[PDB]
Amino acid sequence: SRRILLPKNVIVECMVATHASIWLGCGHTDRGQLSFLDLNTEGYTSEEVADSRILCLALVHLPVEKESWIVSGTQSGTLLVINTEDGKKRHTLEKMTDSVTCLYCNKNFLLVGTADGKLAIFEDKTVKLKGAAPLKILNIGNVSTPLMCLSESTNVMWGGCGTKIFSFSNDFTIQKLIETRTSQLFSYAAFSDSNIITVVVDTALYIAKQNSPVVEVWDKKTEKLCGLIDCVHFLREKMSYSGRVKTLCLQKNTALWIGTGGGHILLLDLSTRRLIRVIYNFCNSVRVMMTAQLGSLKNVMLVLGYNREIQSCLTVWDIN
Amino acid sequence: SRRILLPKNVIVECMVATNASIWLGCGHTDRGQLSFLDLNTEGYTSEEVADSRILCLALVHLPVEKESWIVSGTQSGTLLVINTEDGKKRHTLEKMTDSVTCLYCNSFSQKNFLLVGTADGKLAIFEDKTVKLKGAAPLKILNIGNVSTPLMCLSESNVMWGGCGTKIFSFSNDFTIQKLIETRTSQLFSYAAFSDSNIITVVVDTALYIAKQNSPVVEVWDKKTEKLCGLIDCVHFLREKMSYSGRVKTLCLQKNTALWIGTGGGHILLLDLSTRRLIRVIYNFCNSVRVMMTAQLNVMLVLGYNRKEIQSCLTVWDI
Ligand SMILES: O=C1C[C@H](C(=O)N2CCC(c3c[nH]c4ccc(F)cc34)CC2)CCN1
Numbered sequence: 001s002r003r004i005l006l007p008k009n010v011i012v013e014c015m016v017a018t019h020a021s022i023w024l025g026c027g028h029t030d031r032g033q034l035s036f037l038d039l040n041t042e043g044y045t046s047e048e049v050a051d052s053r054i055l056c057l058a059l060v061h062l063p064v065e066k067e068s069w070i071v072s073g074t075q076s077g078t079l080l081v082i083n084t085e086d087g088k089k090r091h092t093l094e095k096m097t098d099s100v101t102c103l104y105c106n107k108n109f110l111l112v113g114t115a116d117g118k119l120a121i122f123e124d125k126t127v128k129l130k131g132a133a134p135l136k137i138l139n140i141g142n143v144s145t146p147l148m149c150l151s152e153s154t155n156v157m158w159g160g161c162g163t164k165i166f167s168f169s170n171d172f173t174i175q176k177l178i179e180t181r182t183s184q185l186f187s188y189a190a191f192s193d194s195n196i197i198t199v200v201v202d203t204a205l206y207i208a209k210q211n212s213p214v215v216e217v218w219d220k221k222t223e224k225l226c227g228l229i230d231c232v233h234f235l236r237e238k239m240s241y242s243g244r245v246k247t248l249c250l251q252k253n254t255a256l257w258i259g260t261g262g263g264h265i266l267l268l269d270l271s272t273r274r275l276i277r278v279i280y281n282f283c284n285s286v287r288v289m290m291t292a293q294l295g296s297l298k299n300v301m302l303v304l305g306y307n308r309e310i311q312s313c314l315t316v317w318d319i320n
Numbered sequence: 321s322r323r324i325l326l327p328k329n330v331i332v333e334c335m336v337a338t339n340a341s342i343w344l345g346c347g348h349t350d351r352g353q354l355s356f357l358d359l360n361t362e363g364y365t366s367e368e369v370a371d372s373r374i375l376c377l378a379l380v381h382l383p384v385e386k387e388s389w390i391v392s393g394t395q396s397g398t399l400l401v402i403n404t405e406d407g408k409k410r411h412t413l414e415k416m417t418d419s420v421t422c423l424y425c426n427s428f429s430q431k432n433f434l435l436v437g438t439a440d441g442k443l444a445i446f447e448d449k450t451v452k453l454k455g456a457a458p459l460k461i462l463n464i465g466n467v468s469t470p471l472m473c474l475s476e477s478n479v480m481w482g483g484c485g486t487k488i489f490s491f492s493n494d495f496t497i498q499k500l501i502e503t504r505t506s507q508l509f510s511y512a513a514f515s516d517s518n519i520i521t522v523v524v525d526t527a528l529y530i531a532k533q534n535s536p537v538v539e540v541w542d543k544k545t546e547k548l549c550g551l552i553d554c555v556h557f558l559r560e561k562m563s564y565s566g567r568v569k570t571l572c573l574q575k576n577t578a579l580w581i582g583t584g585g586g587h588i589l590l591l592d593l594s595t596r597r598l599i600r601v602i603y604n605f606c607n608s609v610r611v612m613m614t615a616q617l618n619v620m621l622v623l624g625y626n627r628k629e630i631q632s633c634l635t636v637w638d639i
């Protein structure tokens with residue numbers, strides 16, 4: 001494990017590693033600032049690239065053309081595309097009707113979730129073209145529901161929109177549309193009515209909600225709540241822990257990492273439904289937890305957390 | 321509303337309401353001490369009536385015979401029966417094979433019965449007319465558990481429900497266990513450790529609301545399907561001073577769709593069972609809630625204590 005300290009008062013909204021260095025979208029500013037951290041030298045440089053805050057980052061790599069583009073999704077709905085080699089070669093795709101609240105890479109596609117519950121689908125070969133429009137736009141929700149996340153079993157894709165879990169495929173038509181507010185009977189009502197912030201797909205769908213210590217477990221086939229993981233109880237068995245879930249992350253098979261707003265990390269064995277390890281006070285608050293392929297067969301876990309004046313830290317370890 | 325302080329260091333294990341008055345079994349002693357509190361004068365009297373701690377109490381009222389008997393279940397298995405009018409009229413019934421952990425008066429159409437739950441998971445049944453007979457033997461003894469599982473609670477809505485270990489049992493007129501639900505399976509939704517704990521209380525309404533030992537979770541079970549149909553987590557109800565354990569000590573159903581939950585921290589939550597929402601919260605009512613029951617003269621009686629010195633209080637209020 002190696003801990004890299006970012007420059008003081010830097011806030012990271014989003015993060016994307018490149019196959020070592022990471023591209024970061026900054027939250028300490030109202031404009032669109034893109035930063036770049038060299039994992040080796042710990043070198044940090046930044047640039048103001050867009051008028052509004054960069055909320056999402058997706059790296060779009062095109063093998064046939066041997067080109068990689070870093071896509072930034074801003075608060076105003078801008079899709080800014082910068083070439084990873086030459087930064088001078090940059091442009092914007094069709095501007096979204098609302099904030100870009102999600103960016104995911106799926107033939108390959110660039111999926112865009114918006115604050116008004118829309119999903120824009122671009123193909124790899126379309127990302128390269130200025131002002132390029134999507135193949136289609138899926139109106140899943142409304143202006144009061146944002147499309148926050150996307151995931152896959154690792155075809156069939158799963159995403160979160162408001163309090164709903166949705167699935168789509170090759171045809172790009174909504175298949176499963178599960179209302180999760182139904183968990184109110186087993187979970188605390190306020191947590192059930194919160195918007196889905198993250199989704200992880202294994203044998204079931206594990207979902208986290210805004211300001212909630214409860215991870216809801218849903219069956220993919222029955223479309224019913226088949227379980228609950230309450231971080232408040234896993235942490236207490238010091239008593240003041242909010243246990244709010246900020247990040248959900250699957251490791252291989254039957255292992256789920258949970259990062260809390262109070263800066264704790266819990267690892268659960270899904271096969272035995274038992275807490276393996278808890279890392280208390282990892283930092284003051286855990287923000288992002290993701291897997292990254294950094295080189296040839298170099299697979300690593302990245303944790304972004306911050307301390308209390310803000311001090312953001314990036315922890316790196318080999319995912320065994 | 322009013323607060324009646326008991327003499328300093330008096331500990332109440334059990335209560336039964338009967339001026340308005342209450343019979344108390346004391347927990348500040350290793351012998352059987354039966355107390356009496358006049359709820360009007362606040363007058364307190366007690367007497368050492370048995371050799372071991374009184375854990376349970378029940379009033380057996382025979383309106384035909386025009387008599388009333390207070391039944392005390394002790395730590396050694398004694399069922400001591402005392403006449404409420406003449407305390408010199410007293411006798412014991414057949415001694416139980418272990419501690420008396422539950423006493424309840426129920427009716428079946430119409431006959432009335434005294435139900436005796438034991439620490440070795442047994443249920444002895446005595447018809448009301450049997451209770452006035454010295455050394456009387458029960459009508460039937462049902463083995464629902466073992467020495468590890470105490471029959472801790474008994475309730476009704478005629479069908480009797482109870483809890484023995486982590487199993488919920490049901491029985492009717494025939495006195496034969498009908499439904500036997502394993503609750504350890506709440507583990508998928510509830511925190512496993514809470515699911516594995518023994519049942520300490522059961523309330524019967526449209527569903528079964530069960531509390532478990534050292535648990536902030538009220539498990540809600542469906543009588544017809546015999547499957548979990550809800551959870552009421554008191555830690556989250558109290559939080560939305562975040563350090564509350566929210567451990568359930570008592571459950572008491574008030575009239576039509578309203579449940580009172582008394583916690584170890586001295587808090588009382590009131591929930592509307594039809595809207596599943598919280599009506600009222602009484603934060604730091606006392607330091608810790610022990611007993612919560614309804615008495616027809618109508619009134620809600622709460623027994624709490626504050627703490628080398630213990631001060632028990634009784635709070636009474638018109639419903
Ligand atoms: O769809 C399925 C998958 C089910 C399964 O095997 N699952 C899903 C439910 C999961 C779950 C519930 N409660 C938990 C508490 C802690 C914890 F780590 C995990 C859980 C455990 C894995 C079996 C039937 N069918």
Ligand SMILES: O=C1C[C@H](C(=O)N2CCC(c3c[nH]c4ccc(F)cc34)CC2)CCN1
Binds near residue numbers: 540542549596
């Ligand atoms: O026969 C029935 C009635 C059941 C019902 O209607 N119930 C049970 C579940 C209960 C419940 C869940 N979560 C809560 C949170 C607070 C609170 F006060 C109460 C609850 C109250 C409603 C349905 C199946 N079986």
